[PDB]
Amino acid sequence: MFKAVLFDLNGVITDTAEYHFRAWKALAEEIGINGVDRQFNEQLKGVSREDSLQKILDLADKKVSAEEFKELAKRKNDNYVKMIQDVSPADVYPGILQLLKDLRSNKIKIALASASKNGPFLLERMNLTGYFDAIADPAEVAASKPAPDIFIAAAHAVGVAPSESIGLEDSQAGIQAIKDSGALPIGVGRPEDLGDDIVIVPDTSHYTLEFLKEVWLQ
C-alpha cells in the first residue's frame, strides 16, 4: 500500500493560474517585453517565481541587476496576492476535501509539492492546513519542475520515499517531476496534453481513495 500522497497546488487542489498569468502579463508590458501570451504561460506552470521571471526576460534577452530582479518579482507577487484575496473554502476543487479526509483517516500522509511560496497562504484561506503533514518549501529546492526535487523533498518531509508515494498533477512538467522522483503520477486533464502512458482522470472528482488504491495495484 502507498504510504503518502503528494499534492500539487494549482490545478489539483484549486487553480489560481489565471491570476499568475494576468500578473506576469502585466509586468512584461511594464518592462517592454512582448510574447507573454497564454501559450507562453503554459511553460510557466510548475515553475518557481525566480525561474518564471527569468523565462520572461530571456524572451527579449533582457539583462537586469539582482536588485532590479528582486523588485520585479516582488511587484508581480504583490499584484498576484492582491488578486487572490477573496479565495476561500469555496475555491477548493471537487472531491479534494473528501479525499484529504479519507487519506487522513487511513493514516496516509499528505504533503504539498507546489512551486509557489504562496502555498501555505492558500491552504490557510481554503481551511486545508490541518490535513497537511508537510509543505515542501520551494525556497529550499535546487530546481523547478520538471526537475523532481520538489516531490522528493515533499516525500521526505513526511518521512517516506517517493517510491512509497502517489503524485497528483495537472501539468506535463509536474508529471515528469513525479516520474523522476520514483513516485506514481496520476494526472488530471486531457491525455492529449499529459500523455497516454499514465493514468489520467478528466476532473478531480475522480480522485477518490478507492481509485488511488486501484491504480497503485494495477
Ligand X SMILES: O=P(O)(O)OC[C@H]1O[C@@H](OP(=O)(O)O)[C@H](O)[C@@H](O)[C@@H]1O
Q: Closer to ligand X by CB, 115 or 178: give it.
A: 115
Mask: binding to ligand X, 17-56, rule CB under 6 A, as x and -? ---x-----------------------xxxxxx--x----
Q: Is the dihedral of CA 14, 136, 110, 3 positive or negative?
A: positive
Distance CA 207, CA 198 (A): 14
> Radius of gyration (Cα) for the chain, nearest Å?
17
Q: Closer to Mg ion by CB, 159 or 202: give it.
A: 202
**Cell matching residue 55:** 523565462
Under a CB-based contact definition with an 8 Å cutoff, are residues 65 and 53 in contact?
no
**CA 134 from chain center: how many Å?**
14
Residue 115 interacts, among ligand X, Mg ion, none and using kind-specific CB cut-offs from 5 to 8 Å, with ligand X
Out of 2, 5, 6, 11, point to the residue binding Mg ion (CB under 5 A): 11
Mask: binding to Mg ion, 128-167, rule CB under 5 A, as x and -? ----------------------------------------
189: alpha, beta or left, given left = phi > 0 and alpha = psi -120 to 50?
left
10 counts as binding Mg ion under rule CB under 5 A: yes
CB of 64 to Mg ion, least distance (A): 27
CB of 150 to Mg ion, least distance (A): 11
Distance CA 172, CA 17 (A): 15
Q: Cβ contacts of residue 193 below 8 Å, gap of 6+? A: 172
Q: Which amino acid is at 66?
A: A
Distance CA 173, CA 46 (A): 6
Out of 2, 8, 14, 160, point to the residue binding ligand X (CB under 6 A): 8
CB of 194 to Mg ion, least distance (A): 11
79 counts as binding ligand X under rule CB under 6 A: no
Residue 14 interacts, among Mg ion, ligand X, none and using kind-specific CB cut-offs from 5 to 8 Å, with none
Nearest to 25 by CA among 64, 100, 79: 79
CB of 4 to ligand X, least distance (A): 17
Residues binding Mg ion (CB under 5 A): 8, 10-11, 170-171
Residues binding ligand X (CB under 6 A): 8-11, 20, 44-49, 52, 77, 114-118
